[PDB]
Design an enzyme around this catalytic site. Sequence first.
Site, PDB file in Angstrom:
ATOM      1  N   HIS A   1       0.820  -1.269   0.043  1.00  0.00           N
ATOM      2  CA  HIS A   1      -0.226   0.019  -0.034  1.00  0.00           C
ATOM      3  C   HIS A   1       0.858   1.164   0.019  1.00  0.00           C
ATOM      4  O   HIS A   1       0.387   2.335  -0.380  1.00  0.00           O
ATOM      5  CB  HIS A   1      -0.860   0.096   1.156  1.00  0.00           C
ATOM      6  CG  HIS A   1      -1.868   1.150   1.318  1.00  0.00           C
ATOM      7  ND1 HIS A   1      -2.569   1.811   0.321  1.00  0.00           N
ATOM      8  CD2 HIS A   1      -2.303   1.869   2.295  1.00  0.00           C
ATOM      9  CE1 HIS A   1      -3.196   2.671   0.656  1.00  0.00           C
ATOM     10  NE2 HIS A   1      -2.924   2.838   1.885  1.00  0.00           N
TER      11      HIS A   1
ATOM     12  N   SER B   1      -0.995  -0.957  -6.129  1.00  0.00           N
ATOM     13  CA  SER B   1      -0.760  -2.048  -6.880  1.00  0.00           C
ATOM     14  C   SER B   1      -0.345  -1.504  -8.309  1.00  0.00           C
ATOM     15  O   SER B   1      -0.359  -0.508  -8.837  1.00  0.00           O
ATOM     16  CB  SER B   1      -1.993  -2.589  -6.849  1.00  0.00           C
ATOM     17  OG  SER B   1      -2.493  -3.135  -5.727  1.00  0.00           O
TER      18      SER B   1
ATOM     19  N   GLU C   1       3.250 -34.298  -4.171  1.00  0.00           N
ATOM     20  CA  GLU C   1       1.970 -33.970  -4.606  1.00  0.00           C
ATOM     21  C   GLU C   1       2.187 -33.148  -5.838  1.00  0.00           C
ATOM     22  O   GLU C   1       3.312 -32.753  -6.061  1.00  0.00           O
ATOM     23  CB  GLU C   1       1.189 -33.196  -3.721  1.00  0.00           C
ATOM     24  CG  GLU C   1      -0.388 -33.417  -3.674  1.00  0.00           C
ATOM     25  CD  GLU C   1      -1.146 -33.188  -2.467  1.00  0.00           C
ATOM     26  OE1 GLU C   1      -0.279 -32.920  -1.333  1.00  0.00           O
ATOM     27  OE2 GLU C   1      -2.301 -32.754  -2.491  1.00  0.00           O
TER      28      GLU C   1
ATOM     29  N   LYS D   1     -15.930  -7.482  -7.646  1.00  0.00           N
ATOM     30  CA  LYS D   1     -14.975  -8.176  -8.486  1.00  0.00           C
ATOM     31  C   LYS D   1     -14.369  -9.432  -7.636  1.00  0.00           C
ATOM     32  O   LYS D   1     -14.273 -10.454  -7.871  1.00  0.00           O
ATOM     33  CB  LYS D   1     -14.086  -7.448  -9.221  1.00  0.00           C
ATOM     34  CG  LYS D   1     -13.375  -7.999 -10.515  1.00  0.00           C
ATOM     35  CD  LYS D   1     -12.982  -6.838 -11.429  1.00  0.00           C
ATOM     36  CE  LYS D   1     -12.052  -7.498 -12.358  1.00  0.00           C
ATOM     37  NZ  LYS D   1     -11.446  -6.599 -13.481  1.00  0.00           N
ATOM     38  N   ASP D   2     -13.799  -9.018  -6.414  1.00  0.00           N
ATOM     39  CA  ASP D   2     -13.346 -10.013  -5.593  1.00  0.00           C
ATOM     40  C   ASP D   2     -14.499 -11.072  -5.129  1.00  0.00           C
ATOM     41  O   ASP D   2     -14.204 -12.079  -5.114  1.00  0.00           O
ATOM     42  CB  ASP D   2     -12.806  -9.317  -4.307  1.00  0.00           C
ATOM     43  CG  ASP D   2     -11.196  -8.657  -4.543  1.00  0.00           C
ATOM     44  OD1 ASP D   2     -10.709  -8.950  -6.024  1.00  0.00           O
ATOM     45  OD2 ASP D   2     -10.543  -8.548  -3.757  1.00  0.00           O
TER      46      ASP D   2
HETATM   47  C1  HEM Z   1      -3.788 -23.298  11.592  1.00  0.00           C
HETATM   48  C2  HEM Z   1      -4.669 -23.804  10.501  1.00  0.00           C
HETATM   49  C3  HEM Z   1      -4.486 -25.335  10.077  1.00  0.00           C
HETATM   50  C4  HEM Z   1      -4.915 -26.257  11.070  1.00  0.00           C
HETATM   51  C5  HEM Z   1      -5.475 -26.225  12.273  1.00  0.00           C
HETATM   52  C6  HEM Z   1      -4.629 -27.406  10.122  1.00  0.00           C
HETATM   53  C7  HEM Z   1      -4.973 -28.585  10.779  1.00  0.00           C
HETATM   54  C8  HEM Z   1      -4.837 -29.779   9.982  1.00  0.00           C
HETATM   55  C9  HEM Z   1      -4.967 -30.933  10.441  1.00  0.00           C
HETATM   56  C10 HEM Z   1      -5.444 -31.316  11.989  1.00  0.00           C
HETATM   57  C11 HEM Z   1      -4.541 -32.100   9.511  1.00  0.00           C
HETATM   58  C12 HEM Z   1      -4.451 -33.563   9.544  1.00  0.00           C
HETATM   59  C13 HEM Z   1      -6.079 -33.875   8.834  1.00  0.00           C
HETATM   60  C14 HEM Z   1      -5.627 -34.936   7.999  1.00  0.00           C
HETATM   61  O1  HEM Z   1      -4.693 -34.832   7.049  1.00  0.00           O
HETATM   62  O2  HEM Z   1      -6.209 -36.088   7.656  1.00  0.00           O
HETATM   63  C15 HEM Z   1      -4.132 -31.129   8.237  1.00  0.00           C
HETATM   64  C16 HEM Z   1      -3.809 -31.622   7.133  1.00  0.00           C
HETATM   65  C17 HEM Z   1      -3.518 -30.937   6.126  1.00  0.00           C
HETATM   66  N1  HEM Z   1      -3.267 -29.619   5.978  1.00  0.00           N
HETATM   67 FE1  HEM Z   1      -3.677 -28.588   7.466  1.00  0.00          FE
HETATM   68  N2  HEM Z   1      -4.274 -27.046   9.048  1.00  0.00           N
HETATM   69  C18 HEM Z   1      -3.840 -25.751   8.990  1.00  0.00           C
HETATM   70  C19 HEM Z   1      -3.534 -24.906   7.891  1.00  0.00           C
HETATM   71  C20 HEM Z   1      -3.175 -25.353   6.621  1.00  0.00           C
HETATM   72  C21 HEM Z   1      -2.755 -24.826   5.513  1.00  0.00           C
HETATM   73  C22 HEM Z   1      -2.662 -23.294   5.503  1.00  0.00           C
HETATM   74  C23 HEM Z   1      -2.556 -25.710   4.457  1.00  0.00           C
HETATM   75  C24 HEM Z   1      -1.853 -25.222   3.253  1.00  0.00           C
HETATM   76  C25 HEM Z   1      -0.695 -24.781   3.208  1.00  0.00           C
HETATM   77  C26 HEM Z   1      -2.994 -26.858   4.914  1.00  0.00           C
HETATM   78  C27 HEM Z   1      -2.666 -28.237   4.241  1.00  0.00           C
HETATM   79  C28 HEM Z   1      -2.956 -29.506   4.877  1.00  0.00           C
HETATM   80  C29 HEM Z   1      -2.609 -30.698   4.280  1.00  0.00           C
HETATM   81  C30 HEM Z   1      -2.111 -30.628   2.586  1.00  0.00           C
HETATM   82  C31 HEM Z   1      -2.938 -31.530   4.912  1.00  0.00           C
HETATM   83  C32 HEM Z   1      -3.131 -32.971   4.310  1.00  0.00           C
HETATM   84  C33 HEM Z   1      -4.333 -33.366   3.714  1.00  0.00           C
HETATM   85  C34 HEM Z   1      -4.312 -34.963   3.266  1.00  0.00           C
HETATM   86  O3  HEM Z   1      -4.589 -35.681   4.439  1.00  0.00           O
HETATM   87  O4  HEM Z   1      -3.935 -35.329   2.474  1.00  0.00           O
HETATM   88  N3  HEM Z   1      -3.372 -26.786   6.212  1.00  0.00           N
HETATM   89  N4  HEM Z   1      -4.265 -29.951   8.707  1.00  0.00           N
HETATM   90  C1  HEM Z   2      -0.343 -17.064   0.096  1.00  0.00           C
HETATM   91  C2  HEM Z   2       0.587 -16.095   0.032  1.00  0.00           C
HETATM   92  C3  HEM Z   2       0.490 -14.950  -0.528  1.00  0.00           C
HETATM   93  C4  HEM Z   2      -0.571 -13.849  -0.216  1.00  0.00           C
HETATM   94  C5  HEM Z   2      -1.967 -14.253   0.706  1.00  0.00           C
HETATM   95  C6  HEM Z   2      -0.767 -12.594  -1.022  1.00  0.00           C
HETATM   96  C7  HEM Z   2      -1.540 -11.784  -1.138  1.00  0.00           C
HETATM   97  C8  HEM Z   2      -1.257 -10.483  -1.849  1.00  0.00           C
HETATM   98  C9  HEM Z   2      -2.454  -9.755  -1.848  1.00  0.00           C
HETATM   99  C10 HEM Z   2      -3.817  -9.665  -1.351  1.00  0.00           C
HETATM  100  C11 HEM Z   2      -1.989  -8.696  -2.532  1.00  0.00           C
HETATM  101  C12 HEM Z   2      -2.655  -7.420  -3.005  1.00  0.00           C
HETATM  102  C13 HEM Z   2      -2.674  -7.199  -4.718  1.00  0.00           C
HETATM  103  C14 HEM Z   2      -3.479  -8.313  -5.383  1.00  0.00           C
HETATM  104  O1  HEM Z   2      -3.918  -9.238  -4.461  1.00  0.00           O
HETATM  105  O2  HEM Z   2      -3.427  -8.424  -6.582  1.00  0.00           O
HETATM  106  C15 HEM Z   2      -0.830  -8.861  -3.353  1.00  0.00           C
HETATM  107  C16 HEM Z   2       0.140  -8.358  -3.955  1.00  0.00           C
HETATM  108  C17 HEM Z   2       1.238  -8.793  -4.463  1.00  0.00           C
HETATM  109  N1  HEM Z   2       1.925 -10.046  -4.125  1.00  0.00           N
HETATM  110 FE1  HEM Z   2       1.225 -11.173  -3.121  1.00  0.00          FE
HETATM  111  N2  HEM Z   2       0.710 -12.868  -1.752  1.00  0.00           N
HETATM  112  C18 HEM Z   2       1.151 -13.941  -1.432  1.00  0.00           C
HETATM  113  C19 HEM Z   2       2.276 -14.456  -1.988  1.00  0.00           C
HETATM  114  C20 HEM Z   2       3.196 -13.945  -2.607  1.00  0.00           C
HETATM  115  C21 HEM Z   2       4.373 -14.243  -3.431  1.00  0.00           C
HETATM  116  C22 HEM Z   2       4.883 -15.752  -3.412  1.00  0.00           C
HETATM  117  C23 HEM Z   2       4.682 -13.137  -4.069  1.00  0.00           C
HETATM  118  C24 HEM Z   2       5.843 -13.479  -4.988  1.00  0.00           C
HETATM  119  C25 HEM Z   2       5.880 -14.432  -6.115  1.00  0.00           C
HETATM  120  C26 HEM Z   2       3.963 -12.143  -4.148  1.00  0.00           C
HETATM  121  C27 HEM Z   2       4.174 -11.182  -5.084  1.00  0.00           C
HETATM  122  C28 HEM Z   2       3.166 -10.030  -4.883  1.00  0.00           C
HETATM  123  C29 HEM Z   2       3.318  -8.947  -5.740  1.00  0.00           C
HETATM  124  C30 HEM Z   2       4.531  -8.567  -6.462  1.00  0.00           C
HETATM  125  C31 HEM Z   2       2.303  -8.097  -5.433  1.00  0.00           C
HETATM  126  C32 HEM Z   2       2.000  -6.835  -5.973  1.00  0.00           C
HETATM  127  C33 HEM Z   2       1.159  -7.018  -7.290  1.00  0.00           C
HETATM  128  C34 HEM Z   2       0.236  -5.876  -7.521  1.00  0.00           C
HETATM  129  O3  HEM Z   2      -0.497  -5.433  -6.875  1.00  0.00           O
HETATM  130  O4  HEM Z   2       0.401  -5.150  -8.691  1.00  0.00           O
HETATM  131  N3  HEM Z   2       3.050 -12.489  -3.255  1.00  0.00           N
HETATM  132  N4  HEM Z   2      -0.339 -10.037  -2.567  1.00  0.00           N
END
Ligand code: HEM
Ligand code: HEM
Lengths: 55, 238, 373, 48, 66, 76
Positions: free
Chosen positions: C194, C198, C264, C220-221
């Site tokens: 900000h 953007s 994966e 739009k979002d």
């Molecule tokens: C704090 C928030 C989150 C909690 C409490 C949480 C909790 C859990 C728990 C308890 C499991 C085991 C369930 C299972 O796999 O059978 C799980 C699996 C998994 N979580 Fe999360 N999770 C969270 C956020 C995330 C996020 C942000 C991602 C992605 C980056 C993610 C990706 C996964 C994946 C890929 C699995 C395995 C799915 C599978 O069984 O194939 N989780 N999560």
């Molecule tokens: C899950 C993780 C991420 C979240 C939640 C996130 C979220 C956001 C959000 C909400 C914006 C505001 C503008 C828009 O959404 O278009 C933004 C802008 C941006 N993000 Fe991310 N972002 C993530 C990861 C990344 C990564 C990995 C990169 C680099 C490869 C990245 C590069 C950027 C850039 C360059 C902008 C500015 C683009 C623009 O507004 O013109 N972000 N991000």
Amino acid sequence: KGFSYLVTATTTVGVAYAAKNVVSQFVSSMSASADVLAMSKIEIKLSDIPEGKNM
Amino acid sequence: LELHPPSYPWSHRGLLSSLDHTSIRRGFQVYKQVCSSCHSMDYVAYRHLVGVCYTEEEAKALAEEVEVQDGPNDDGEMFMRPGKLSDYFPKPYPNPEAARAANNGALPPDLSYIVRARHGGEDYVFSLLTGYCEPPTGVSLREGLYFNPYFPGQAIGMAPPIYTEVLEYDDGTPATMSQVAKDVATFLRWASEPEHDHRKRMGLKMLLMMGLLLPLTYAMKRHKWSVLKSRKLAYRPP
Amino acid sequence: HPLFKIINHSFIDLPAPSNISSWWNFGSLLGVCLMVQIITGLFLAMHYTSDTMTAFSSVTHICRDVNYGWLIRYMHANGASMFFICLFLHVGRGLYYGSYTFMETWNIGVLLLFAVMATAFMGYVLPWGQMSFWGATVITNLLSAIPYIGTTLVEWIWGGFSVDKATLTRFFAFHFILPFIIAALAIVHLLFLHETGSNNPTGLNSDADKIPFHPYYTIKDILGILIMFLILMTLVLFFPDMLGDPDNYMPANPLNTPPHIKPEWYFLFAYAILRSIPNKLGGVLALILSILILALMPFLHTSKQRSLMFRPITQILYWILVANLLILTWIGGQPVEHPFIIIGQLASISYFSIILILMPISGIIEDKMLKLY
Amino acid sequence: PSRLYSLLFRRTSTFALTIAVGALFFERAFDQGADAIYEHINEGKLWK
Amino acid sequence: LVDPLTTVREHCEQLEKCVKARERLELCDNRVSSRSQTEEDCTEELFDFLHARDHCVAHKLFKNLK
Amino acid sequence: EFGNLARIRHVISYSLSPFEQRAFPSYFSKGIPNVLRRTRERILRVAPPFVVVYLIYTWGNQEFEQSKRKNPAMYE
Ligand code: HEM
Ligand code: HEM
Ligand code: HEC
């Protein structure tokens, strides 16, 4: 204006329907699941408890 | 290098095609009379059936059919109770070793999630159970083995368990080997996903709701964005 | 009001460019996906048990008896897949339109990308299937590469000689705690942006044409959220097992190993690179660079135009980069045998040469064509 | 119809009120309808 | 009790494409057997025939079955 | 914030109220031509990399199969 406001009301209801459902599902999840839901079973034997004893 | 089971036109395959639920009934009978001697449906309990293909009281019948002894006893180290609705399906060979002992050291994998755990399971299952063909020239399976073109290595310890008319379907549908393999593949499928039907109903409601809501939200966006999309700019240097 | 000052300014009146396409939706989708994951993760945490004794069963119970518990579990898994889809498209938008010149935003982004990959890896270890256990061992042992610091470090994470309960429980704790750090890093990501506003697809200064965000980029979002929800649910409710793996439905057997093991889909491009380099260490490093090369990206911009809207040669090089990224995703899947290996080796060479060498030289040539250089 | 706008949409609260009532009834219809549609779709393959 | 599969496998083999394949395999079989010191097996040959037969069966088995 | 974003001069800007304009004017009327106009201007930059990805993917598959194919001379 009506037509436009109509569209929004409609969209609103739609989101609401799905919203109510998904949330309900989640809250339902926390609710006791079937695993514990089934507990009606109970087994008893009168002879074991003599007069004046709680079990 | 493995034979890749073909695609069968499984009824439940359809986007909104729920599991037969009539066939399953037959399939289980197949598991109870044939497959339960070696394999363990650990994650499926009698109660699970209620609502799919057996009614509450009906399930109670089956539950009682088998006997389940629990160790906790006042003085005894066990008490035998005919299975209750809650009881899970009875696994044979309590320890896997037991199984190995009698199964040529090959553990019958729990068929609870077999369909989900096997690539292209439903097909694989059907194929394996029906793929017990003749071993080819040059092959030398070790003692206690059989030949199935699909099984990894084509050397599955499990002997062919479905001989035509192996068991009689209570419904009376001819118990041909195939009719039995298709029923047990449907059942195992159900086992690996008891919610298959409920979900597809949720998916149908989701498609109807998204078909209602996407053009309306698009229309609201195009209302609010029309203002700009019609904006006419003009440069008027003095 | 102090809060409303922060709110309106940041979420309602944020002067936004009027001409940003649907690709600019994706980052907001990522935030929504994060919340969705957290919410679903919380409802997995009320029934999951980290004990290696009950993990598989805990999960089974989750998809069998927990009310709508199958829905929340498969929403969590396919929401992780949707998170990586939106993440890859967000990074591709940043690479194509020259948004990496916002250097602090880009670096906080690549930190967020590393954190999300670590979170997804430990989450995939969490259900304690056959595939989870062998997957954990495998790239954990990857850490065993470092000569003096590596070995001990591995068992340190493994918390023992080999991954076992010690790992599962600490992986549950770390997988629980990292998405909140991801949320805080995303708040820092939004702040560092900000300050600069953007970017637009033309890559020009959009200060002459900016509109509010509440009525123009909010609806739009909302529409993008609705479309992303359509794709997720139709990837849970109709094709629930499409993105997963069947061997994860077997319990974790240390004595056997799944014959065909693969990361994966999202982690494959990296997998390919690792496999390509003959040296173990080389693979690990290249792998890291694979992600890190992006951070390095703002120092490689040698053009006088920010975006690729008016740059056709670098557009061709960009789509060749997307092409061999898809090729590396495919190769990872393929087993170790001819000629998958050679493609992998070339594809990795072409990937690093296009990002490192070909794009700045092409930008110099494009500046020469416009009589600028 | 102007009546709708004049009576149901003009007052923001009514705008909500109508939405609220509509929501209260939409579920009934949609659920039942989709249920039956589903039932018909899988007319023979079910528990019954 | 005629298992529909049995009949289907008949018709499917009767498919010419499939017919040609079986021939190839048999050649392999005898070739393999005839060859004295060898390890090549017709499994791959067997595999190929099956794919086709199965595909064909796939097209006509489910319906036959009840 | 707004008011201090930029300095323009003499750029008049006309607009209409949302409810005074049709929702999707000439939508498919010009939308199709435009979408097609767009696809032309970008198809030669986008498509041929994915075309050769398809050729390399097929090639790899077939080559791999042939690789798995048994040498006629094998074990004979
Ligand atoms: C704090 C928030 C989150 C909690 C409490 C949480 C909790 C859990 C728990 C308890 C499991 C085991 C369930 C299972 O796999 O059978 C799980 C699996 C998994 N979580 Fe999360 N999770 C969270 C956020 C995330 C996020 C942000 C991602 C992605 C980056 C993610 C990706 C996964 C994946 C890929 C699995 C395995 C799915 C599978 O069984 O194939 N989780 N999560
Ligand atoms: C899950 C993780 C991420 C979240 C939640 C996130 C979220 C956001 C959000 C909400 C914006 C505001 C503008 C828009 O959404 O278009 C933004 C802008 C941006 N993000 Fe991310 N972002 C993530 C990861 C990344 C990564 C990995 C990169 C680099 C490869 C990245 C590069 C950027 C850039 C360059 C902008 C500015 C683009 C623009 O507004 O013109 N972000 N991000
Ligand atoms: C009386 C014994 C017996 C019967 C009946 C039996 N099995 Fe098995 N099964 C085994 C043994 C022993 C193994 C272990 C073989 C191995 O691991 O190689 C096994 C393994 C399997 C496997 C594992 C294959 C793989 O991919 O690793 C599947 C699938 C299977 N059986 C399916 C069935 C189905 C389906 C039925 C009936 C509809 C059935 N079995 C009936 C003894 C039996």
